[PDB]
Amino acid sequence: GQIKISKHANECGLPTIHTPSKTKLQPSVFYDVFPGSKEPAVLTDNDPRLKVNFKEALFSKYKGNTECSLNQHMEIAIAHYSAQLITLDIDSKPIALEDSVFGIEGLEALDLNTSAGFPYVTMGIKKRDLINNKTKDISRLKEALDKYGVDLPMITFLKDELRKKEKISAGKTRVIEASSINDTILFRTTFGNLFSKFHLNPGVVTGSAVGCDPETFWSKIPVMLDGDCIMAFDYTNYDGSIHPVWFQALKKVLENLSFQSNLIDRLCYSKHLFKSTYYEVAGGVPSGCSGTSIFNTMINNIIIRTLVLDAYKNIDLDKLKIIAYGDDVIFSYKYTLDMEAIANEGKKYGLTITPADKSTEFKKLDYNNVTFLKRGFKQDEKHTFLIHPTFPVEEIYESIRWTKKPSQMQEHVLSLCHLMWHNGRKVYEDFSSKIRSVSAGRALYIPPYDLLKHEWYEKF
Ligand SMILES: [K+]
Numbered sequence: 001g002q003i004k005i006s007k008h009a010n011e012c013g014l015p016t017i018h019t020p021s022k023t024k025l026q027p028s029v030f031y032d033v034f035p036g037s038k039e040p041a042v043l044t045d046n047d048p049r050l051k052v053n054f055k056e057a058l059f060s061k062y063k064g065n066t067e068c069s070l071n072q073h074m075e076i077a078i079a080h081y082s083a084q085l086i087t088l089d090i091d092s093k094p095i096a097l098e099d100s101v102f103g104i105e106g107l108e109a110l111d112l113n114t115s116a117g118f119p120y121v122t123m124g125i126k127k128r129d130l131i132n133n134k135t136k137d138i139s140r141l142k143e144a145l146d147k148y149g150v151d152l153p154m155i156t157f158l159k160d161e162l163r164k165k166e167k168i169s170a171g172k173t174r175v176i177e178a179s180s181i182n183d184t185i186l187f188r189t190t191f192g193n194l195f196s197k198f199h200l201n202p203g204v205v206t207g208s209a210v211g212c213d214p215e216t217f218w219s220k221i222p223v224m225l226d227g228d229c230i231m232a233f234d235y236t237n238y239d240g241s242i243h244p245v246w247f248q249a250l251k252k253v254l255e256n257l258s259f260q261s262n263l264i265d266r267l268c269y270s271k272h273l274f275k276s277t278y279y280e281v282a283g284g285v286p287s288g289c290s291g292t293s294i295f296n297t298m299i300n301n302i303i304i305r306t307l308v309l310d311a312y313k314n315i316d317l318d319k320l321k322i323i324a325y326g327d328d329v330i331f332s333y334k335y336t337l338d339m340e341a342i343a344n345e346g347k348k349y350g351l352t353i354t355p356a357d358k359s360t361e362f363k364k365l366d367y368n369n370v371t372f373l374k375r376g377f378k379q380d381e382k383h384t385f386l387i388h389p390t391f392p393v394e395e396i397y398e399s400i401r402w403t404k405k406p407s408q409m410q411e412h413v414l415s416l417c418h419l420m421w422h423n424g425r426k427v428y429e430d431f432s433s434k435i436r437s438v439s440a441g442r443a444l445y446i447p448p449y450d451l452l453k454h455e456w457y458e459k460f
Pocket of ligand 1: 001267268269270281282283284285286
């Protein structure tokens, strides 16, 4: 991604936006009970913890684009991925405004708690003021679409969340680039049936895990991804590193499904508003907004195919099975490929890819050490076709030590329990006892292991 334009907002017909510079994260009642070293992310230039300039850190996400063109290997990649997708017989017709608001089969209802974006943020107008959920009345929304129109700047919010210590010093706090409700409605209106089909068919034909429930989906992964060689790897700054050429490739895949392509240009060449700065960037996917997860997944599908083609002169793409969730990816081939060779092919395109899970070098992977959506794989000891999604124990301890809303510790703890029991019985009873080593913890309800185990079985 490359900042092409950076000017004062008032010079480009726009107001200054006011960023909350104060974390809601506060030490929880379990802070001293569990070990950890994560702290709330930096949200101001005035921050004792900093050791770098803050403004530079936020925008280094946009390093620049390499010189490259849509090559032959990409052309084969889009043809191959498109044939898979033509198999699903997706309806390329648009959906109705009411269905984009209140949801359809496969496409859940619009979240009414996320911000409505520009210009509503400037005048206190929230999503619930435009859309009434009990009346199902959306008169104000219709009024607001005609009035303010379409193709509005994305407001960039700092992400108030826990980070590792190293990332506090270096100013590495993440960003979300939230689109106006007017634009998310427009993308849902045009691409709604695409998103729907993807959500109902997670797996190796869509090549996506978007919308999946890992509690059931994990058992299905090892049958979809057959073939001896299990592969995965990490991307450094996936969103911001995606060259325009992958957006071109994406548009062609959508055209092969009979959708219009024009709207993807608004993600590739995007408009942004941070504080008092209007800026435009070429390349990069805007992190976390208008149907972003699905397009990121489709791009990853094009990238994996393309990189494997670049690395291996002889490959059968039909046996290259791929499951992606944005930048997260797990995949397989019918015999052993070299992850390091495939990784090296990313450099010419401006992609930086390294060994999976912070690993020092590329190592062979199977189901005892492979990770997807941060989760390992662990079979049930009785019914070995039922696979537990294993969540990392350290992240759970880290999360429970902090809170944005102390009155909701019960809900926070329930979330962590559903994650933790998969790791094992003994580990879960250890977590439970430590919670209950303190007054506030004894007061909370903790689901018995056997409750969780049978809720899980009564789910297949
Ligand atoms: K962009």
